[PDB]
């Protein structure tokens, strides 16, 4: 029931990422000379979070006060000195409440496998690509897939001649 | 009843992972020269979790205060010294409540078995593949299956000539 | 259901960013001599936040007072001196409450992949572009995409001859 | 009644594991040159569990406090010294409640018996397989069956010529 809807959601996301990669990889490598497939680890767990933050007021310069009683006594007779300080302070503090409801269906970790073809010249020899072109393909695929390191995304692009 | 629905859910997930692997393994190895099967250990246990986190306030620099009473007395007569400090502090602390309902049907551990064929040239000799090509197949299968180490995923790709 | 609406929202945003890039990249590079694709990481999490700020009043110059009792006693008999100061102060503080409801559907991180063609002169030789022109294209794409560093936007523009 | 439904559930699970093993064991060993049967020890016991976890706060660095009263007295007359420290602390602790309802019908222990045939060449001599091929079959069967050591899974693959 709901599981099938989630699976179809994942399939559509993967297909659209695949198409976005293919769109940029087509003009330079050529139609059919590139194949990519995407798998997506998604987030279907309902989470609700409330965050409370208090600004520190331990420093007297940023401390906000409402009432303060400072009783000071010094009975000098060091000799028979007698110092007494009774201090009472009531503070008002900065407060920030944030309520967050995470979206259901977010992407947790995306791994993408891309395979490119060789280059057959007018003679027909399948000449492999170069390192610079491979790096360009890797960068383009990283851009298309929305590659990020916090998610833990992995990308692998290899070059091999396609079968007949 | 519900068990059959869960089993069909597992079968669909396994079939889609299999198809995703086959899709990338087809262009280079060739149609029929690759077979893969997927088994999935799934999560059909309803879990509900509430998490509460308090930011530490043991350091006076990050401690937020509402009221503070500091009575200090020093009756010097070390001699007949008499020091007395009565300190009362009321704090306000950061608080974060997170409520999480894990999705039913998540994947716990995925193990995938892939078998590839040999290479029969124009003569017909079944020449086995190379180490580099095997490593490429392993990487592509890891990308397609969404291989992860936290889950405990295992992958095995072997090369052997297919039977008639 | 809602996930499909969110996905269509993302697709429309990406398509419009793509069209905006293409619009400026067309007059100089030429029709078809430029291809760009956009992926957008969006924000579909409902957040509500209330912020409270208190202006500090620890300095006597900016401190606002309602009532103040200052009892001062000095019984000089340093000799048998006896100083006593009982100070009670009630303050009024500046207060700023801000209530914010973040919009659903905002952009978190935008990464854009742009590919340009080579320059075929009247002879037909595919002459590559220059560094200055590449920098101009990068700047124009950054302007069109709304490039920002707080979001974490990444842009990659590469030059390569288009396939037939 | 319910027992028959559980038994049919076990039979379907065993049959699907058998088919998954046969699917990968077929292309290399050959159709009919492999037979496997699966038995499954299942879990039809309804379990409900609630877990409560408290983060330790014995270290003053990670201890979160709400109110703290520290009365310190030192009447020096070691001589007639008199030290007195009355400390009262109220803490707030991290709390995590997890409620888990285990699924009914999970697998406890899976043991699988697989038998393979010999190799009859063009002459017809039933040549036995090799150690490397046997290891490959064992690995493939382990992958297909979802072999795990926490469950206590056992696998046995033997080579013997099939009867007429």
């Amino acid at each position: 029931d709901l599981n099938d809807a989630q699976l179809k959601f994942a399939n559509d996301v993967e297909s659209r990422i695949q198409r976005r990669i293919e769109a940029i990889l087509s003009p330079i490598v050529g139609n059919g000379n590139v194949h990519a497939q995407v798998t997506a680890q998604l987030d279907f767990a309902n989470k609700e979070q409330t965050e409370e933050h208090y600004s520190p007021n331990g420093d007297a310069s940023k401390a906000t006060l409402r009432s303060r009683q400072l009783n000071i006594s010094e009975q000098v007779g060091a000799g028979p000195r007698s110092t007494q300080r009774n201090e009472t302070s009531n503070y008002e503090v900065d407060r920030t409440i944030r309520h967050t409801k995470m979206n259901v269906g977010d992407i947790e970790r995306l791994s993408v496998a891309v395979v490119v073809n060789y280059k057959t010249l007018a003679d027909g020899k399948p000449l492999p690509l170069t390192a610079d072109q491979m790096k360009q393909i890797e960068d383009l695929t990283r851009e298309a897939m929305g590659f990020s390191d916090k998610r833990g995304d992995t990308l692998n692009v290899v070059n091999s001649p396609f079968s007949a | 009843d519900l068990n059959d629905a869960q089993l069909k859910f597992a079968n669909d997930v396994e079939s889609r992972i299999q198809r995703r692997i086959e899709a990338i393994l087809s262009p280079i190895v060739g149609n029929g020269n690759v077979h893969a099967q997927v088994t999935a250990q799934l999560d059909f246990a309803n879990k509900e979790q509430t998490e509460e986190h308090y930011s530490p306030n043991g350091d006076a620099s990050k401690a937020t205060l509402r009221s503070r009473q500091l009575n200090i007395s020093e009756q010097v007569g070390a001699g007949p010294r008499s020091t007395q400090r009565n300190e009362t502090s009321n704090y306000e602390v950061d608080r974060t409540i997170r409520h999480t309902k894990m999705n039913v049907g998540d994947i716990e551990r995925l193990s995938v078995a892939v078998v590839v064929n040999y290479k029969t040239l124009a003569d017909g000799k079944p020449l086995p593949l190379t180490a580099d090509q095997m490593k490429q197949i392993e990487d592509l299968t890891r990308e397609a299956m969404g291989f992860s180490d936290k889950r405990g995923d295992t992958l095995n790709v072997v090369n052997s000539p297919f039977s008639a | 259901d809602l996930n499909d609406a969110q996905l269509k929202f993302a697709n429309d945003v990406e398509s419009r960013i793509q069209r905006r890039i293409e619009a400026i990249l067309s007059p100089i590079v030429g029709n078809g001599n430029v291809h760009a694709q956009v992926t957008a990481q969006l924000d579909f999490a409902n957040k509500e936040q209330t912020e409270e700020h208190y202006s500090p009043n620890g300095d006597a110059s900016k401190a606002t007072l309602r009532s103040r009792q200052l009892n001062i006693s000095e019984q000089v008999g340093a000799g048998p001196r006896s100083t006593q100061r009982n100070e009670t102060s009630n303050y009024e503080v500046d207060r700023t409450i801000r209530h914010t409801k973040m919009n659903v559907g905002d952009i978190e991180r935008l990464s854009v992949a742009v590919v340009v063609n080579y320059k075929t002169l009247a002879d037909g030789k595919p002459l590559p572009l220059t560094a200055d022109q590449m920098k101009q294209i990068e700047d124009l794409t950054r302007e069109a995409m709304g490039f920002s560093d707080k979001r974490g936007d990444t842009l990659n523009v590469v030059n390569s001859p288009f396939s037939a | 009644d319910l027992n028959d439904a559980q038994l049919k559930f076990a039979n379907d699970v065993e049959s699907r594991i058998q088919r998954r093993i046969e699917a990968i064991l077929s292309p290399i060993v050959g159709n009919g040159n492999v037979h496997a049967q699966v038995t499954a020890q299942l879990d039809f016991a309804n379990k409900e569990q609630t877990e409560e976890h408290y983060s330790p706060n014995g270290d003053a660095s990670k201890a979160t406090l709400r109110s703290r009263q520290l009365n310190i007295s030192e009447q020096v007359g070691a001589g007639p010294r008199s030290t007195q420290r009355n400390e009262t602390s109220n803490y707030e602790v991290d709390r995590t409640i997890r409620h888990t309802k285990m699924n009914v019908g999970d697998i406890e222990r899976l043991s699988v018996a697989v038998v393979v045939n010999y190799k009859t060449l063009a002459d017809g001599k039933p040549l036995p397989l090799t150690a490397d091929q046997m290891k490959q079959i064992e690995d493939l069967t382990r992958e297909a069956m979802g072999f795990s050591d926490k469950r206590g899974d056992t696998l046995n693959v033997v080579n013997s010529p099939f009867s007429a």
Partner: peptide
């Protein structure tokens, strides 16, 4: 209760909205 803590976070969200 787990549902009790859910209610606490709900009342915290209510306070947020009210502010």
């Amino acid at each position: 209760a787990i549902q009790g803590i859910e209610g606490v976070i709900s009342q915290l969200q209510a306070t947020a909205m009210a502010a």
